């Protein structure tokens, strides 16, 4: 069993925790309880290989913004999450991308761009805009809903595949 260290990052309230808990427990969290730092484990077979995912769920609130280096050092791959009804969260993505690159001293860190809350009709970030950004980063873009489960496995397991081939 190969162990994979995944880290979920992005602005406050975009659904990092809901995505993670949907993956781990098949449950949608309706409450908004801001995270400090949470970790989860999941045994799962991906492309016929059994592995063990360690998932770090991080704080998006700005008050925690000086405490990120320590978790970025440990992560092997990163889910960079924004919400498709929150343009500010999309604009915050590049800051996470740049910090990760700095801390890991690499232009080649496994990442997936995730556009969450795709169950909501009132979109403010268009898919094309996010896809263009993803291409500029050399990474896939996956739209998700923590509420309905759409895309959730695809997002996490695509990140595993990128770590695996790194």
């Amino acid at each position: 069993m190969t162990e994979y260290k995944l880290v979920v990052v992005g602005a406050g309230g975009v659904g990092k925790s809901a995505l993670t808990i949907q993956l781990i427990q098949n449950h949608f969290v309706d409450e908004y309880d801001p995270t400090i730092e949470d970790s989860y484990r999941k045994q799962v077979v991906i492309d016929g290989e059994t592995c063990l995912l360690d998932i770090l769920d991080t704080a998006g609130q700005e008050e925690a913004s000086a405490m990120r280096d320590q978790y970025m050092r440990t992560g092997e791959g990163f889910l960079c999450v924004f919400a498709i009804n929150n343009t500010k969260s999309f604009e915050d993505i590049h800051q996470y991308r740049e910090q990760i690159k700095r801390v890991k001293d690499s232009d080649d860190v496994p990442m997936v761009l995730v556009g969450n809350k795709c169950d909501l009709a009132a979109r403010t970030v268009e898919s094309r805009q996010a896809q263009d950004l993803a291409r500029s980063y050399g990474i896939p873009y996956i739209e998700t809903s923590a509420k309905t489960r759409q895309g959730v496995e695809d997002a996490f397991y695509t990140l595993v595949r990128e770590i695996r081939q790194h």
Binding site: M1, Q22, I24, Q25, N26, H27, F28, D33, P34, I36, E37, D38, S39, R41, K42, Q43, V44, V45, T50, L56, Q61, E63, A64, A66, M67, Q70, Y71, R73, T74, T148, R149, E153
Partner: protein, 469 residues
């Protein structure tokens, strides 16, 4: 250079690391042993987070620190003194200018705020995942509510207000799937006719499914509080480990039910049909990764009353002997193949709990509570880490739900199963062994014939599922 710290005389958590207060294992450090002060310092360290350590600590600390004392210590941790103005600040102030306060600002940003936030994370995890401390001590809960409810200052405000709400929620206290569950399967017994439910009349697929849902729920209900301190083995086990015991007693009852079904079927041909049906249920248990269920069956087939039934063994189809053999091999060599299989499958699954129990107990019994170093007694934390690694593995398999539909009547049937009736264990297991001797006597006594007891067809419908539109 490094930030200066408060004086260790006004803030205990600033004492320097030494071998008299902390020992590390041979990229964050792993603690072998330490004083409780040092454990709490590292639990809430300014340089890094350690979410695994938080779980390990909160799961196991009661073996070295009382809950009331833990709360006192983390409140003490939280209350960090700010440093005085520096020489450059002094000079600015004397000139009527605003000081830069560079050192103060750095200390707030890089020591106080991370440590305070990490104390709050301990509180958050404590309340969310170890709330039993507060259920059992109302005064402890009051103290936590009061501490959280009086934290001032905007840096922590979001989390303080959140933790307050989480506490209030916990005081007064839904699954989504990638697919639809398969259709419930029926055999001789039809929906609503609970009076006819039995081993051979329910569909073997649905027997395995409903037992798996039941056993999964029982497995998922067991909390670490029922395990740490080996409390399920001690005199107050019924108080401290009720969900664990309910789970074990279910397993025991099902095994005995299988044995009873077999030896109370005196007709050889009918008894062969009973055993074959049980091995089909085992096959579906295997397909569902219900290892508890697999071992319930294997335990029955290896029991004294059943094991000796050579005439019955002789008529079991070769393919079913192979299935039973493979299941039996899981347990061989101290569960070597079981452990490997568990670690290879795709959950959901239902682990066999017994191995965990033995490993927790032996870890507890085989390691000292303290290490003596330089005249000091240090808490042996590596022992606690080992116990929490086991509880962590247990919890990891508790997350994934089965995509199977409950059948309320079949569920009730197996919940109410009581093969021993009002009999005590020894009298019942003697009864089963005597039945075994009756239906297949020891050589050279001749093998008797017995009349059939079932009036319905014995042919199995098989264990491959059907699917109408």
């Amino acid at each position: 250079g490094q930030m200066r710290l408060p004086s260790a005389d006004v803030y205990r958590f600033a004492e320097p690391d030494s071998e008299e207060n902390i020992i590390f294992e041979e990229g964050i450090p792993i603690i072998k042993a330490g004083t409780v002060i040092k454990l709490i310092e590292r639990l809430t360290y300014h340089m890094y987070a350690d979410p695994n350590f938080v779980r390990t600590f909160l799961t196991t600390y009661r073996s070295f620190c009382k809950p009331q004392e833990l709360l006192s210590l983390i409140i003490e941790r939280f209350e960090i003194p700010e440093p005085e103005p520096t020489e450059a600040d002094r000079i600015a102030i004397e000139n009527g200018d605003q000081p830069l306060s560079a050192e103060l600002k750095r200390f707030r940003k890089e020591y106080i705020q991370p440590v305070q936030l990490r104390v709050l994370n301990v509180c958050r995890h404590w309340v969310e995942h170890h709330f039993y401390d507060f259920e059992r001590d109302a005064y402890l809960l009051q103290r936590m509510e009061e501490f959280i409810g009086t934290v001032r200052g905007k840096a922590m405000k979001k989390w303080v207000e959140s933790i307050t709400k989480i506490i209030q929620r916990k005081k007064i206290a839904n699954i989504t799937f990638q697919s639809s569950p398969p259709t419930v399967e029926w055999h001789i017994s039809r929906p609503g006719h609970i009076e006819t439910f039995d081993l051979l009349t329910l569909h073997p697929i649905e027997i395995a499914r409903q037992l798996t849902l039941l056993e999964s729920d029982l497995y998922r209900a067991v909390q670490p509080s029922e395990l740490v301190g080996s409390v399920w083995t001690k005199e107050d086990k019924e108080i401290n480990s009720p969900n664990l015991l309910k789970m074990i007693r279910h397993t025991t009852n099902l095994t005995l039910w299988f044995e009873k079904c077999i030896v109370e079927t005196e007709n050889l041909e009918e008894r062969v049909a009973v055993v074959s049906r049980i091995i089909e249920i085992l096959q579906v248990f295997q397909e569902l990764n219900n290892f508890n269920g697999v071992l319930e069956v294997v335990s029955a087939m290896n029991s004294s009353p059943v094991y000796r039934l050579d005439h019955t063994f002789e008529q079991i189809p070769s393919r079913q002997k192979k299935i039973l053999e493979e299941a039996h091999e899981l347990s061989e060599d101290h569960y070597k193949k079981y452990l490997a299989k568990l670690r290879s499958i795709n959950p959901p699954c239902v682990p066999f709990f017994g191995i965990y129990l033995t490993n927790i107990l032996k870890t507890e019994e085989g390691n000292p509570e303290v290490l003596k170093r330089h005249g000091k007694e240090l808490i042996n934390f590596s022992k606690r880490r080992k116990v929490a690694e086991i509880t962590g593995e247990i919890q990891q398999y508790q997350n994934q739900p089965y995509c199977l539909r409950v059948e309320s009547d079949i569920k009730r049937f197996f919940e109410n199963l009581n093969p021993m009736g009002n009999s005590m264990e020894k009298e019942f297991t003697d009864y089963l062994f005597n039945k075994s001797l009756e239906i297949e006597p020891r050589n050279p006594k001749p093998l008797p014939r017995f009349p059939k007891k079932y009036s319905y067809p014995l042919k199995s419908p098989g264990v491959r599922p059907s699917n109408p539109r």
